[PDB]
Amino acid sequence: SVPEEMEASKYVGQGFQPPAEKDAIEFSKKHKDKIAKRGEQFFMDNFGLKVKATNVVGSGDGVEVFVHCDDHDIVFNASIPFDKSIIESDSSLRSEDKGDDMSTLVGTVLSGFEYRAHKEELDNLTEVLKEYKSKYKYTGYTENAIMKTQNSGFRNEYYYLTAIPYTLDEYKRYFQPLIKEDDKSFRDGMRNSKKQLKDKSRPYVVTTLFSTKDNFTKDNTIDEMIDFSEVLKKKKNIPHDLNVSLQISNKYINTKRPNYSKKEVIEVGVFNHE
C-alpha cells in the first residue's frame, strides 16, 4: 500500500491521484497510449510545441495527461483534462476555448518561454540550490515526482517559475512565432511581446524545499533561511532581474495530492521588483 504522507526525498509519485471515479481511473490504464498520443497532439495543434506524456490518470469522470516539453529550449510541465470520448478520433484538437482554463494553460506554457529567455541565469540558480542543500539542510522534490505529478509550468527539483497568462489568440499572435527564432532574436521578441501586451511585471521564481530536520519548525529554521537569502543576494550570476522567493517546509509530502502550496512554509524574499 501507499501511506498518506512520505518523506519528499523518497516520494516518486506513488499513490498520486487527482479526484476521480474508479471507472475513470480504470479507463486511463486501458487507453494509456491513445490518451498520451491525443495529449501530445493537443499541445502540437494549439501551441506548436512537441511534448512527451509523463503520466495518464483518471480525473473527474474523464482522464488527464501530464506532459513535459523540452523543445527549442522551451521547457515546462503541464496537464490537460479530456473526456473518455478522446479515444474516438485522431482529428484536430485545435481549441476554441476562450475561458480561464485556456488562459491559465497559456500561462503554464509561457513559463517555458520565460525559462528560455533567462536560461543561463536560471540554470545557475539550479546549480547554487544543489550547492547549498547540505549546509541549509534541505532537498527538493525527486525528478520522478515533478515529472509525474506537477503541471504548473517550468519546474525542477528545487523551484518552479510562473508567467503571466494570455488567451490562445494572444499566444498565436505574440509567442508561437518566436519558437523557431535564434536565442538573441527570441529574447528580443520576448521583450517586444511584453511592451505590446503592456506587462511591466517580472516572472516569479519560488523554491520548493523540504527540510531534512526531524524537528523542523518555522521558528527554528527562519534564521537559516534569512542567511541563505543573504548568500543568494551576493551571487552575481543568478536571476537578480526576476522575482525570487525562498520557501522551505518540513520533510513530508502528501502522496495522493503532492501540493507544496498547501504546506506550512517559511517564506523569505530574495529579489523583488513589485
Amino acid at 240: H
Q: Which of 151, 142, 115 is nearest to 242 (CA)?
A: 115
Please give the grid coordinates belonging to residue 265.
512554509
Task: Classify burial at 215, counting beta carbons within 10 Å of its beta carbon; exposed 0-12, middle 13-18, buried 19 or more.
Answer: exposed
Amino acid at 223: D
**Whole-angstrom distance, CA of residue 226 vs CA of residue 77:** 30
Angle 119-131/100-117 helices, nearest 10 degrees?
80
For the chain, the residue count is: 274
Q: 69 near 78, Cβ under 8 Å?
A: yes
Structural domain spans, the chain: 1-274
Q: What is the dihedral of CA 214, 217, 221, 222, to 10 degrees?
A: 170
Task: Classify burial at 17, counting beta carbons within 10 Å of its beta carbon; exposed 0-12, middle 13-18, buried 19 or more.
Answer: middle
Please give the grid coordinates belonging to residue 25.
481511473
